[PDB]
Design an enzyme around this catalytic site. Structure first.
Site, PDB file in Angstrom:
ATOM      1  N   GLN A  93       0.794  -1.221   0.000  1.00  0.00           N
ATOM      2  CA  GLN A  93       0.000   0.000   0.000  1.00  0.00           C
ATOM      3  C   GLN A  93       0.832   1.280   0.000  1.00  0.00           C
ATOM      4  O   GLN A  93       0.259   2.361  -0.177  1.00  0.00           O
ATOM      5  CB  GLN A  93      -0.927  -0.001   1.215  1.00  0.00           C
ATOM      6  CG  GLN A  93      -0.189   0.107   2.547  1.00  0.00           C
ATOM      7  CD  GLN A  93      -1.170   0.126   3.694  1.00  0.00           C
ATOM      8  OE1 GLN A  93      -1.539  -0.924   4.227  1.00  0.00           O
ATOM      9  NE2 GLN A  93      -1.624   1.324   4.068  1.00  0.00           N
ATOM     10  N   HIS A 111      -6.001  -0.946  11.480  1.00  0.00           N
ATOM     11  CA  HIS A 111      -5.401  -1.530  10.286  1.00  0.00           C
ATOM     12  C   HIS A 111      -6.267  -2.671   9.767  1.00  0.00           C
ATOM     13  O   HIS A 111      -6.532  -3.636  10.494  1.00  0.00           O
ATOM     14  CB  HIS A 111      -3.976  -2.013  10.607  1.00  0.00           C
ATOM     15  CG  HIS A 111      -3.158  -2.371   9.403  1.00  0.00           C
ATOM     16  ND1 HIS A 111      -3.021  -1.540   8.312  1.00  0.00           N
ATOM     17  CD2 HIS A 111      -2.411  -3.469   9.135  1.00  0.00           C
ATOM     18  CE1 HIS A 111      -2.241  -2.117   7.414  1.00  0.00           C
ATOM     19  NE2 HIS A 111      -1.858  -3.291   7.888  1.00  0.00           N
ATOM     20  N   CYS A 117      -5.339   0.746   3.722  1.00  0.00           N
ATOM     21  CA  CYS A 117      -5.439  -0.639   4.183  1.00  0.00           C
ATOM     22  C   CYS A 117      -6.832  -1.203   3.938  1.00  0.00           C
ATOM     23  O   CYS A 117      -6.983  -2.365   3.554  1.00  0.00           O
ATOM     24  CB  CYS A 117      -5.098  -0.735   5.668  1.00  0.00           C
ATOM     25  SG  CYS A 117      -6.193   0.241   6.726  1.00  0.00           S
ATOM     26  N   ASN A 139      -0.961  -9.288   5.008  1.00  0.00           N
ATOM     27  CA  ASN A 139      -0.827  -7.851   5.176  1.00  0.00           C
ATOM     28  C   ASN A 139      -0.617  -7.206   3.802  1.00  0.00           C
ATOM     29  O   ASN A 139      -0.547  -7.891   2.779  1.00  0.00           O
ATOM     30  CB  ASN A 139       0.320  -7.572   6.156  1.00  0.00           C
ATOM     31  CG  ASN A 139       0.320  -6.158   6.724  1.00  0.00           C
ATOM     32  OD1 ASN A 139      -0.574  -5.355   6.482  1.00  0.00           O
ATOM     33  ND2 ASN A 139       1.352  -5.857   7.509  1.00  0.00           N
TER      34      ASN A 139
HETATM   35  C1  LIG Z   1      -5.263   1.544   7.477  1.00  0.00           C
HETATM   36  C2  LIG Z   1      -3.826   1.568   6.934  1.00  0.00           C
HETATM   37  O1  LIG Z   1      -3.665   2.139   5.810  1.00  0.00           O
HETATM   38  O2  LIG Z   1      -2.920   1.048   7.593  1.00  0.00           O
HETATM   39  C3  LIG Z   1      -5.879   2.941   7.424  1.00  0.00           C
HETATM   40  O3  LIG Z   1      -5.181   3.807   8.285  1.00  0.00           O
HETATM   41  C4  LIG Z   1      -7.388   2.914   7.682  1.00  0.00           C
HETATM   42  O4  LIG Z   1      -8.171   3.302   6.831  1.00  0.00           O
HETATM   43  N1  LIG Z   1      -7.807   2.454   8.866  1.00  0.00           N
HETATM   44  C5  LIG Z   1      -9.231   2.385   9.138  1.00  0.00           C
HETATM   45  C6  LIG Z   1      -9.507   1.199  10.039  1.00  0.00           C
HETATM   46  C7  LIG Z   1      -9.005  -0.104   9.434  1.00  0.00           C
HETATM   47  C8  LIG Z   1      -9.703  -0.395   8.108  1.00  0.00           C
HETATM   48  C9  LIG Z   1      -9.276  -1.214  10.436  1.00  0.00           C
HETATM   49  C10 LIG Z   1      -9.731   3.681   9.762  1.00  0.00           C
HETATM   50  O5  LIG Z   1      -9.266   4.087  10.819  1.00  0.00           O
HETATM   51  N2  LIG Z   1     -10.694   4.297   9.061  1.00  0.00           N
HETATM   52  C11 LIG Z   1     -11.320   5.546   9.454  1.00  0.00           C
HETATM   53  C12 LIG Z   1     -12.301   6.101   8.421  1.00  0.00           C
HETATM   54  C13 LIG Z   1     -13.700   5.498   8.461  1.00  0.00           C
HETATM   55  C14 LIG Z   1     -14.725   6.405   7.779  1.00  0.00           C
HETATM   56  N3  LIG Z   1     -15.062   7.561   8.591  1.00  0.00           N
HETATM   57  C15 LIG Z   1     -15.986   8.472   8.287  1.00  0.00           C
HETATM   58  N4  LIG Z   1     -16.189   9.484   9.131  1.00  0.00           N
HETATM   59  N5  LIG Z   1     -16.714   8.425   7.184  1.00  0.00           N
END
Ligand SMILES: *[C@@H](C(=O)O)[C@H](O)C(=O)N[C@@H](CC(C)C)C(=O)NCCCCNC(N)=[NH2+]
Ligand SMILES: *[C@@H]1O[C@H](CO)[C@@H](O[C@@H]2O[C@H](CO)[C@@H](O)[C@H](O)[C@H]2NC(C)=O)[C@H](O)[C@H]1NC(C)=O
Length: 219
Positions: free
Chosen positions: A19, A164, A25, A184
């Site tokens: 990525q 993640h 992720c 991963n």
């Molecule tokens: C994951 C990565 O690239 O390592 C990346 O930081 C990520 O998108 N993490 C997610 C959670 C994972 C899929 C478990 C995250 O924190 N997403 C937050 C956004 C969710 C949508 N929020 C709103 N307000 N629409």
């Protein structure tokens, strides 16, 4: 009922991807699970476009390289009528304008299923009977960055604060410790050729069974 599952051996898992420095992720986890479902229902393993998701799925709650959710991606794919192939819509690792092309669709989905929150027995049943499962984990600890081999066992992990998205492609037992086999998106030089064995049946360690889901295909 299988004690050991490894969907790579059945041909249901694409090579490990990278990525880079984009918070995508969620897109790699979503394409991983849909790649599995498309293969298991057609016999064809087709690599799917994370960039399609990063660029195009904002209206379903995602924010490109600033983050997103696997279920948001599955909903976008359903509304959009599909997702492009990796080959036709390759990955840049940066936010872009949506250039989705209907003629290059590689797979579709019709919704999604959330696994019962916190239930590792239900996640095990899903991995065995459905295919690779999208999962959310706490990967915030330096021990995860430095993982090399064996069963990852991080007592400082949270089951509530997950950052993640990754892919559960199997499970088993190693040195008497139950594990999850996890793909991963940090390239093949990380971990065990891009994979990690995470602790299973240790009270939902790192939250791997907290937000697990998979796409539905067909009826
Ligand atoms: C994951 C990565 O690239 O390592 C990346 O930081 C990520 O998108 N993490 C997610 C959670 C994972 C899929 C478990 C995250 O924190 N997403 C937050 C956004 C969710 C949508 N929020 C709103 N307000 N629409
Ligand atoms: C995704 O996982 C989170 C984190 O575990 C879940 O949020 C928890 O849900 C349980 C449900 O029993 C609550 O008791 C906790 O208070 C929640 N924790 C937090 C930090 O909010 C969430 O429900 C999961 N989402 C889905 C769709 O399964």
């Amino acid at each position: 009922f299988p004690q050991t599952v490894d969907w790579r051996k059945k041909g249901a898992v694409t090579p490990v991807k990278n990525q880079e420095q984009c918070g995508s992720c969620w897109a790699f986890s979503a394409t991983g699970s849909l790649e599995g479902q498309h293969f298991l229902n057609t016999g064809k393993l087709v690599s799917l476009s994370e960039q399609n998701l990063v660029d195009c799925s904002d209206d379903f709650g995602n924010i490109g390289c600033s983050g997103g959710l696997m279920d948001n991606a599955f909903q976008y794919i359903k509304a959009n009528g599909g997702i492009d192939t990796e080959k036709s819509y390759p990955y840049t690792g940066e936010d872009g304008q949506c250039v989705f092309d209907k003629s290059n669709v590689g797979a579709a989905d019709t919704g999604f299923v959330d696994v019962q929150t916190g239930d590792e027995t239900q996640l095990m049943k899903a991995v065995a009977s459905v295919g690779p499962i999208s999962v959310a984990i706490d990967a915030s600890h330096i021990s995860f960055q430095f993982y090399a081999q064996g069963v990852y066992d991080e007592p400082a992990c949270s089951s509530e604060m997950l950052d993640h998205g990754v892919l559960a492609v199997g499970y088993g037992t190693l040195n008497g410790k139950d594990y999850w086999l996890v793909k991963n998106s940090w390239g093949a030089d990380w971990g065990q050729e891009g994979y990690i064995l995470m602790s299973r049946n240790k009270n939902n360690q790192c939250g791997i069974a907290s937000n697990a889901s998979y796409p539905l295909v067909g009826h």
